[PDB]
Amino acid sequence: ELYENKPRRPYIL
């Protein structure tokens, strides 16, 4: 739901 703090690259490329 709410946007949480992302770490590195989630799964993007």
State the Cα–Cα distance between residues 4 and 2, nearest whole angstrom. Answer: 6
Query: What length is written for the chain?
Result: 13
Instruction: Output the CA torsion sign for 7, 11, 12, 13.
Output: positive
Q: Residue 4 corresponds to which amino acid?
A: E
State the Cα–Cα distance between residues 4 and 1, nearest whole angstrom. Answer: 9
DSSP single-letter state for residue 4:
P
Q: What does the CA dihedral 2, 12, 8, 3 come to, rounded to 10 degrees?
A: -10
Residue with tokens 């709410």: 2
